Hints:
4 copies of one chain form a homotetramer. By secondary structure, chain A is of the alpha/beta class. The first copy, chain A, folds into 2 domains: 1-168 and 306-362, Alpha-Beta Complex (Quinone Oxidoreductase, Chain A, domain 1); 169-305, Rossmann fold (3-Layer(aba) Sandwich). Chain A is built from 11 helices and 16 strands. In chain A, the strands form 3 sheets. In chain A, strands 3, 4, 5, 6, 7, 15 and 16 form a 7-stranded mixed β-sheet that branches. The interface between A and B is large, with 40 and 40 residues. Strand 13 (287-291) of chain A pairs antiparallel with strand 13 (287-291) of chain B. It is classed as oxidoreductase.
Amino acid sequence: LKDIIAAVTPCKGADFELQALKIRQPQGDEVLVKVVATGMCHTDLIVRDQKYPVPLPAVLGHEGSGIIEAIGPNVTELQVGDHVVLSYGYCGKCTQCNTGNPAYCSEFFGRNFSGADSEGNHALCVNDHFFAQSSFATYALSRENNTVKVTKDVPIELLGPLGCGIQTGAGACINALKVTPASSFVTWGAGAVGLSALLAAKVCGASIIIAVDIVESRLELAKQLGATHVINSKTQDPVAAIKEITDGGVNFALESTGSPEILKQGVDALGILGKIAVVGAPQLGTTAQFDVNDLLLGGKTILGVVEGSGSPKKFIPELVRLYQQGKFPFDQLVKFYAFDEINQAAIDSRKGITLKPIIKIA
Amino acid sequence: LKDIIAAVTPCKGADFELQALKIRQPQGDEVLVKVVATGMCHTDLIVRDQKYPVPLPAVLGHEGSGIIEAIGPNVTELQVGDHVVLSYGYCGKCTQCNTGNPAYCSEFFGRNFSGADSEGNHALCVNDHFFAQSSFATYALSRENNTVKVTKDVPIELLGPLGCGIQTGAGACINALKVTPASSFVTWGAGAVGLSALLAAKVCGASIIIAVDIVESRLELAKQLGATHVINSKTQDPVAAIKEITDGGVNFALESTGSPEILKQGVDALGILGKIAVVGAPQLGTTAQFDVNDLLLGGKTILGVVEGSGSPKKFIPELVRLYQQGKFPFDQLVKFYAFDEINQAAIDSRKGITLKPIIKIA
Amino acid sequence: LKDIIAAVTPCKGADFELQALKIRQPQGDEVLVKVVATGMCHTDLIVRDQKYPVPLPAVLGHEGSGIIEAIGPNVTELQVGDHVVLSYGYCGKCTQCNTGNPAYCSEFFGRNFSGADSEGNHALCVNDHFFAQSSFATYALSRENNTVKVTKDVPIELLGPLGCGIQTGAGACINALKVTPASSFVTWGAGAVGLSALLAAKVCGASIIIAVDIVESRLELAKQLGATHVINSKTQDPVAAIKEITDGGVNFALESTGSPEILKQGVDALGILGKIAVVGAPQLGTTAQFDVNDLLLGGKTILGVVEGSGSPKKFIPELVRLYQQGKFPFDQLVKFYAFDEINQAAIDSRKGITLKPIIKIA
Amino acid sequence: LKDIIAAVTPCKGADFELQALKIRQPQGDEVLVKVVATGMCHTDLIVRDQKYPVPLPAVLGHEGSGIIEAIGPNVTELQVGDHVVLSYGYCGKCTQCNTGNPAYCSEFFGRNFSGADSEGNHALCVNDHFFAQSSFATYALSRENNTVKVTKDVPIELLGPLGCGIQTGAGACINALKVTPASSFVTWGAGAVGLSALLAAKVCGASIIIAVDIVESRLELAKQLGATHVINSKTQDPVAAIKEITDGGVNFALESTGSPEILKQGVDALGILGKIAVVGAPQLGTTAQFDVNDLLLGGKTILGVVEGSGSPKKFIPELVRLYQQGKFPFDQLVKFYAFDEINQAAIDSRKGITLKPIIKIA
Ligand SMILES: NC(=O)c1ccc[n+]([C@@H]2O[C@H](COP(=O)([O-])OP(=O)(O)OC[C@H]3O[C@@H](n4cnc5c(N)ncnc54)[C@H](O)[C@@H]3O)[C@@H](O)[C@H]2O)c1
Ligand SMILES: NC(=O)c1ccc[n+]([C@@H]2O[C@H](COP(=O)([O-])OP(=O)(O)OC[C@H]3O[C@@H](n4cnc5c(N)ncnc54)[C@H](O)[C@@H]3O)[C@@H](O)[C@H]2O)c1
Ligand SMILES: NC(=O)c1ccc[n+]([C@@H]2O[C@H](COP(=O)([O-])OP(=O)(O)OC[C@H]3O[C@@H](n4cnc5c(N)ncnc54)[C@H](O)[C@@H]3O)[C@@H](O)[C@H]2O)c1
Ligand SMILES: NC(=O)c1ccc[n+]([C@@H]2O[C@H](COP(=O)([O-])OP(=O)(O)OC[C@H]3O[C@@H](n4cnc5c(N)ncnc54)[C@H](O)[C@@H]3O)[C@@H](O)[C@H]2O)c1
Ligand SMILES: [Zn+2]
Ligand SMILES: [Zn+2]
Ligand SMILES: [Zn+2]
Ligand SMILES: [Zn+2]
Ligand SMILES: [Zn+2]
Ligand SMILES: [Zn+2]
Ligand SMILES: [Zn+2]
Ligand SMILES: [Zn+2]
């Protein structure tokens, strides 16, 4: 086995602290990865604060990128030295995995959120296997189906975030909603998820692209990214503004705040036959409201989306190619921090000055 | 012009009373119909009680069938003597009508619910043009696009209800949801709309077909129509029953009670990637709730449906053909009343002994 | 009635000649248009040469734009003075028109190709009603459903071609094929139809955009319009080139030459699960070949497309909006000629120096 | 290792002969199956006659059913004693396998047709691994992803054929074409594949169900299975008959003869917007013809289909459930033979008296 450094979250709300640990060699179709850098997402934070019961203590991080250092014996599609992006955790044998919907895997809450493996064994010597990677560390063990080979022609430290927040936002528009050329789209919330979606609606051809938030600097960045219209929902009624701008209501929408009352607003601002995709979440158990009659008479659709609905092994490489061509500049949401500044990376994202932090590890 | 007898609804909640009135000859693409019989629907009742502002006084009825007596000059697809079913009111020139979605016509609330025509002119000499027919009368004026030619080989008095409640229920399953072979389906509410949907899921191939209600005799009829499972939601927790029966949650569902708290139940009982279509309505302005997280993690879809989403000129004849073949026995929901018993037809549907009344007029 | 000048095609292969004729006022839902300019298409030429039996003599032209001068009495969506684009001819009452497929109207060969109206009456005083417009004239009579209102903010002489060749090419990609973001597309033939499709695949997000032709200047223009790759099929094996460029075969394709042997090439160059749309036509009765096994084992799709499959009343305005935004520069295929140079406009398109001619009439 | 009996095909066209061989224990995610019975398909025959280059000598059979006798160590979804159906061979890691299209796996010709494994190793001690099973033997080795658990409540000897011919025919209608309620369908060729499709169109709700063949007894069985119309294409022009019966052309079709000239007939008999799925194959390299203009003006679709396009792990159990309910009586195509009568089973299928043979082995 091997010794490594990893950031541990010791208890409800505790700060990340660096600790010395050990990781074993890979078996079956497992992969041993040398981590270069790992993105930081809202979800790592909500788990520390236990608004989700991942058992503590544990090693979090779910947006890793690195270099393969060792493959197991049944590994056939990856070799030592490949550059990879580590995405969420799926079984690939159930009904949803066999029909091209891994995000809906009947083992989704157990492979990413349990805190362990299939038996209760941990691969780190302390709970691990978080989103099947536990990547706030120098070394990570993943599975072949969640390890995505990417090109060596792009700096590898910048691509971790594609395994979660960027695919989630871009995917909601491309795979789930399917925005069409010449249509109107709006993103509720202008964080890294929303702005990823805004960049993808640009790629789909939409003619009207709107962003709604409460922090002014996030609204200025949206506009610089190509939002045709920006709206401050603290100072303006957003429903009324969206309806006048789109002459009746928007064709496509994204809810990324997780706020219930903003979510009703989002269903109300849809036009006839409009669709709203739901990616943000409130506390376990919260409900939201919608006006019945307005949804039934408008023929409106309300739909739930996990990780953008695609197949990551297919979609992740498509986003890297769109970026190399100059059509999807997600590198503009990023700011790099040192490993010993990981607690400061959390703070900046919560106050809104940093859209997408990336913990440099190697 | 011509003299006729029609049932008038004089004020909030008043009883239908027979009155002598006059109807003019048809113009442009209008059609003059001799009514044989007209179905009765919940919606005629909710308009009398003004939970919807159709201006009173007026002639209601929106499920008519009859014989063409006179066509206007630009009428090209119908001739004197054809047997017809009079469906809802659409413009056929807007964006939704031109793309095959007439139920979503941008003039839907004005052609059926205004109480008049495009200018304010009434064709009956008193508000008319209700669902573009006003068919509780011996004579009705409709438009060519809402007048559907059907075969003379089936008694014409039995087909009126296809212009609304039967198409609504059958259409939600066939056109909107699209139930697939070997799947699980549930109808919340076992009235004429629900039982029409249940009969259509049988046609689509579903292997598990469930019906939930509170009146026992409606649950016995469902089962005799081929429900694999029936559930009384006064005596049993319906969510728990649906989840155990379908091993995790139903693939497809229909909400036809209009009750908000039953509607949350319906979203909760869906399985992974399930879909629930909404056709029943509460009072103008009411909202309903759903659990966020459960909808987002299950990839659930919630969708609004008006009149089954098809094109009636295409779908209505398809239902008559399925019926003649013996595959869609909607005649089992019907009971005939005389024109002078129209007030009693309302009472029986509200207490649940009569599923679908048909006022015989000729 | 009114006197006008129109170009007549007197016999198999005869030259257009200007003649003095008369046009009547509009009835029912008919529209009287003052023509500003009319595009020229390959199809006008093939009808003169009678590879299609439109009865001669007659007034052709099927890509008109103008100003409304008079509306009939049942016209409700257009007024005197609107600027319009005159598209093909559809009934709007049959099964295909009622489901959002007017291009497939069961009266398609009779409304555009018969040479007359529903009865045999001609509106021009000599066969007319060609594509329901006969627009190589100072005045044209159309129907409300084929007359598309557009903005007064764009010169009206440039938009006629949107009623046929530009919608055909752009529509095959947007409505029929549905090209997806990051995919590979190829257009066989780089004339106005192909290059319209190439511009639309740019709008849909495709990462690889290929054009194949035999005239070098058309290949240079494609590349300047944003083709990633161009291929001369006289000098290079195009199948082999397309397969190496897309690492196995293209995802989406368009056949616009009408040449059978090029069409087999097009099915062979598709990759697994690829799709090829057919818009070009050979002589009535010609067949084409495909390799069976390759289509069955690759899961390939071969599909027929008329006028881009959309709804023109919806799609035409979407293209004008994409153009105003700077995302669909179809004005680069155009060259203007005087009315008395109409015979020279035919010659230039047949030799390939002119992509899309526009006969200026007003 | 273990000793067994298996039928070997020694050379171009040789007869099956029983031989004594040996099979090894399973590794990784491999499965050791005790075979009860194996269906016989046209494809076993075409490989013996080498119209496809599977290297001889080898053990064929590709429609097996049996009992699990041993699982490898990474096997998680199957246990010793389960009853299974062995379907075709897929990788489950490529782009097509990850998006829910295993039939289109980029390793399809190598996993079923190579004659060996990934390296050239054979598991039988002589070429094996045929359709990843080689099931004309008492023991078979398969992979976990091609081994489908089914219920112990149905005799296991009857279900092998579901791993190929029955799924192919039923799947073309349910997954690939998607026949809709009240539509018209036709199957060209009334063998086990066609009649499986005919039984599935019954399940999808079609109102008109046609079967075309040249052997009279196969046409009598179709009709007894519920074909509304039967046609002998030796004695009647089938195009003309199909067009008059469906008033213009059929909505959906299946080509299962592999005959090119019958395949053009099939595209000609489609009605506006019709679709024809291609499952039968001619010799490697053969082409077929279609009329261009008729396909382009009708908006017709021609599509290639392998093994019914579904996901077998999902679809196979759906067919067994439809059968138990009494809605898909595929047991009527079957006749059982002894293992030592396997050469006679080939003869009877080629002369058409036996629709689907099943070699009883245990
Ligand atoms: N469903 C999935 O697969 C999935 C995966 C990724 C992220 N998540 C969730 O998606 C969300 C977005 O993540 P992110 O990285 O973009 O977070 P973020 O903090 O970067 O972005 C959210 C934005 O919402 C804005 N906001 C908050 N309250 C608001 C209000 N009342 N009105 C307007 N704007 C408001 C904030 O200003 C912020 O810019 C979080 O809920 C995250 O946990 C879901
Ligand atoms: N969206 C549309 O196009 C459209 C058109 C038709 C009907 N409507 C609406 O659809 C509904 C159905 O019409 P219908 O003719 O079938 O009415 P109905 O009265 O015949 O049927 C509704 C059924 O709901 C049941 N129900 C009521 N409360 C219940 C509860 N708490 N739990 C269980 N069951 C309960 C009743 O027992 C009854 O059988 C009405 O709301 C009607 O106005 C909508
Ligand atoms: N289906 C419909 O609705 C519809 C409507 C519009 C146009 N049409 C047909 O579509 C076609 C395209 O019209 P267009 O205006 O673009 O015509 P065009 O003459 O401008 O373009 C066709 C191109 O094909 C190229 N070509 C011809 N033979 C070739 C070969 N062997 N190899 C490579 N390239 C070759 C020519 O160089 C030319 O550039 C014509 O057949 C027209 O009649 C169909
Ligand atoms: N694409 C796939 O995944 C796949 C898998 C299974 C079967 N196959 C192929 O599908 C086909 C069907 O297999 P099957 O078991 O049903 O074979 P079969 O022999 O049982 O059936 C084919 C039928 O075609 C009929 N036929 C032959 N020539 C005819 C003609 N000219 N006119 C009319 N009828 C004619 C025969 O009478 C026979 O009944 C074969 O080509 C087989 O190899 C394809
Ligand atoms: Zn899974
Ligand atoms: Zn995340
Ligand atoms: Zn309308
Ligand atoms: Zn009604
Ligand atoms: Zn039509
Ligand atoms: Zn044209
Ligand atoms: Zn594969
Ligand atoms: Zn087979």
